[PDB]
């Protein structure tokens, strides 16, 4: 209930940029997708 | 862009004023959207919609169908509302008293009701008398008694009546309508 109450957050693109030159590979291969664990905060904070 | 999960700009699909163009009906609508907006009473809300209803969703309630609903346990003193016209039914030989409120009353129906010392109210009078619709019994007539719906769903083994003009034998009663002529439906 608590979480569905929130609309999905609408983030802008990252301000720093994506790290990486190509997004649609796994984080673990130098890309942006997948579980990147605690490194999620650096991203979101650039997007928020 | 957005992966839409549902068709955009969809109209609700419900009437919202009558399509009718009669002032009086337009006025009764005025009464009841007011009444609906300010009385949290279910009755007014149902009544308002029925007003928008087109002619086919407004089948006539007969005066015999009326008498029967009054025979419900504990219902004989209720005033019956019919958002539509009320027709007469020679087939009943003893009509009760009560008070019917409806849009139209055919001449004979009005007669029969008044003869038994009943009363015929218009919805606006029904309003002043029972703004929350207290003690009201709402009746609808039969929609699927229309002749049209006989032909709905025509198909093999549906058993549903042909769109046909002239009828009698040698009008669509041979091949495919009997085991002895090709097959059956």
């Amino acid at each position: 209930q608590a979480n569905n109450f929130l609309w999905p957050f609408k983030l802008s693109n990252p301000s720093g940029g994506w790290g990486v030159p190509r997004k649609f590979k796994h984080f673990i291969q130098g890309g942006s997708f997948g579980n990147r664990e605690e490194f999620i905060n650096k991203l979101v904070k650039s997007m928020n | 862009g957005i992966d839409h999960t549902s068709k955009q700009h969809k109209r609700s699909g419900h009437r919202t004023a009558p399509k009718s163009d009669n002032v009086y009906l337009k006025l009764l609508v005025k009464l009841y959207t007011f009444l609906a907006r300010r009385t949290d009473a279910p009755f007014n809300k149902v009544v308002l919609k029925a007003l928008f209803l087109s002619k086919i969703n407004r089948p006539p309630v007969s005066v015999s169908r009326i008498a029967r609903a009054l025979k419900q346990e504990g219902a004989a003193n209720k005033t019956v509302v019919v958002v539509g016209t009320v027709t007469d039914d020679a087939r009943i030989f003893e009509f009760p008293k009560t008070t019917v409120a409806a849009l139209r009353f055919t001449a004979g129906a009005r007669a029969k009701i008044v003869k038994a010392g009943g009363e015929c109210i218009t919805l606006d009078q029904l309003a002043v008398r029972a703004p929350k619709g207290q003690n009201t019994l709402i009746l609808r007539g039969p929609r699927n008694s229309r002749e049209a719906v006989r032909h709905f769903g025509m198909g093999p083994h549906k058993g549903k009546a042909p769109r046909i003009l002239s009828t009698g034998r040698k009008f669509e009663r041979a091949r495919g309508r009997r085991r002895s002529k090709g097959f059956k439906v």
């Binding site: 984080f27 673990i28 130098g30 990147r36 664990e37 490194f39 | -």
Partner: protein
């Protein structure tokens, strides 16, 4: 793959009823972050034991820092690598000041001399060549000679303006 850290990664075989306290295995792992490093761990562990991450657990992840980060050391490096037409075992010696530095330029070297991308390499051992004269490869022996001194001929200064009024000089 990036600029490497070196990690101890410890893991073990999800416990059971009949086998609680499973054996525990360690790897040192050269990787840019601990996310790549745990991945790598499972990558090799499923090459040696019957586990997979699904049925196993990481126990500890710790960064190993260089012992004496400002001492020049002679590293011998063992590597396994995949070429286009078959796979291969190698030994190189790299001279730098940390193992982490060393692995940075190994990876560079494999890439440049053998066209081996990071996926196709396995570090086998990285280990400090203790006593000199066990140093094998001459491109390193070279730098171990007594009283070593060499000039840097033909100096290029980087200009900052587009135009110059001099004619330069590569003296030095």
């Amino acid at each position: 793959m990036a600029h490497f850290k070196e990690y101890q990664v410890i893991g073990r075989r999800l416990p059971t009823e009949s086998v609680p306290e499973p054996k525990l295995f360690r790897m040192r792992i050269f990787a840019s972050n601990e996310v790549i490093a745990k991945s790598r761990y499972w990558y090799f562990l499923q090459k040696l034991h019957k586990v997979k991450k699904a049925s196993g657990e990481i126990v500890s992840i710790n960064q190993i820092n260089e012992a004496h980060p400002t001492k020049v050391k002679n590293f011998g490096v063992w590597v396994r690598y995949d070429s286009r037409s078959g796979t291969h075992n190698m030994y190189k010696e790299i001279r730098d000041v940390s193992r982490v530095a060393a692995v940075e330029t190994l990876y560079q070297d494999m890439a440049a001399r053998h066209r081996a991308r990071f996926r196709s390499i396995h570090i086998l051992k990285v280990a400090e060549i203790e006593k000199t004269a066990d140093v094998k490869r001459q491109y390193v022996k070279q730098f171990l000679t007594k009283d070593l001194k060499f000039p840097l001929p033909h100096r290029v200064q980087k200009s900052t303006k587009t135009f110059s009024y001099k004619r330069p000089s590569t003296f030095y």
